[PDB]
Design a protein around this ligand. Structure first.
Ligand code: SAM
Length: 259
């Protein structure tokens, strides 16, 4: 077992309240009270449509991804990454795609800075669509499962998708979710991908401890095995220690207007 597989097995043993306590222990967390109020009421202001905006902000503020030019957002959901990207000065267009049916999050219409540069398309399976060329590739797809096998499969689908888009579309910036980075097969594929496409792996401190998600990004360089293991060891130490409440930080608030 890798440390990550070992972590997953332990996670699966937690009861309901153990799991809840664990999942937010020692993490960073944005205060979503205002955002949720605004969304429930359809109020047009600068709040982020999802928790995801803050994750992309954390990576973008550190230069791990520097959205520019034509941005594609695969698995956009409500659109938290798309709206965040659209607000950035180097960004020309955002093409955003998501399933958007049967319970899956539909894009939410907002008027934050650059909204007019986004084209949202629902009813799209990004794994079964033609590559379109662009400059920035974002993909935030990866649904957790109790089963390592299922998470591994879901992750390989995303990595196979990203590989094809990166090869055919001439992208230069990327930020790709790796749901399950810790199995041998995935680590193997990540090493191969890095050899051809560069980049590194980052753990966003806003991610909950109940997911081992990391992001493959163009604006750093890391190894695979040690970098992933370090995260496994942190998540394991947090599960063995008593839980502590998360550290709150201000959520993403964007300016308004067209670009
Ligand atoms: C983690 S959410 C993205 C959160 C988003 N980055 C945000 O900030 O709001 C991933 C989204 O991918 C969508 N999705 C999953 N599989 C997909 C697929 N095969 N094609 C298109 N969208 C998919 C899901 O419905 C979900 O809404």
């Amino acid at each position: 077992m890798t440390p990550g597989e070992a972590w997953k097995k332990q996670l699966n043993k937690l009861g309901k309240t153990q799991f809840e306590q664990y999942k937010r222990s020692c993490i960073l967390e944005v205060d979503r009270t205002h955002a949720r109020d605004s969304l429930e009421n359809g109020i047009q202001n600068g709040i982020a449509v999802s928790r995801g905006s803050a994750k992309l902000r954390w990576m973008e503020e550190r230069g791990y991804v520097k959205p520019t030019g034509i941005v594609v957002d695969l698995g956009c959901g409500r659109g938290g990454w798309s709206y965040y990207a659209a607000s950035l000065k180097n960004v020309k267009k955002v093409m955003a795609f998501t399933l958007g049916v049967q319970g899956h999050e539909k894009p939410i219409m907002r008027t934050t800075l650059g909204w007019n540069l986004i084209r949202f398309k629902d009813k799209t399976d990004v794994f079964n669509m033609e590559v379109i060329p662009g400059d920035t590739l974002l993909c935030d797809i990866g649904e957790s499962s109790p089963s390592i096998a299922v998470e591994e499969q879901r992750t390989l689908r995303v990595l196979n998708c990203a590989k094809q888009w990166l090869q055919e579309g001439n992208y230069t910036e990327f930020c790709i979710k790796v749901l399950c980075p810790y199995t041998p097969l995935i680590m193997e594929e990540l090493s191969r991908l890095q050899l051809k496409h560069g980049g590194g792996l980052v753990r966003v401190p806003l991610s909950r401890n109940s997911t081992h998600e990391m992001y493959w990004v163009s604006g750093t360089r890391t190894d695979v095995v040690g970098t992933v293991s370090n995260v496994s060891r942190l998540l394991t130490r947090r599960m063995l220690n008593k839980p502590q409440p998360p550290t709150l930080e201000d959520d993403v608030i964007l300016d308004m207007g067209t670009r």
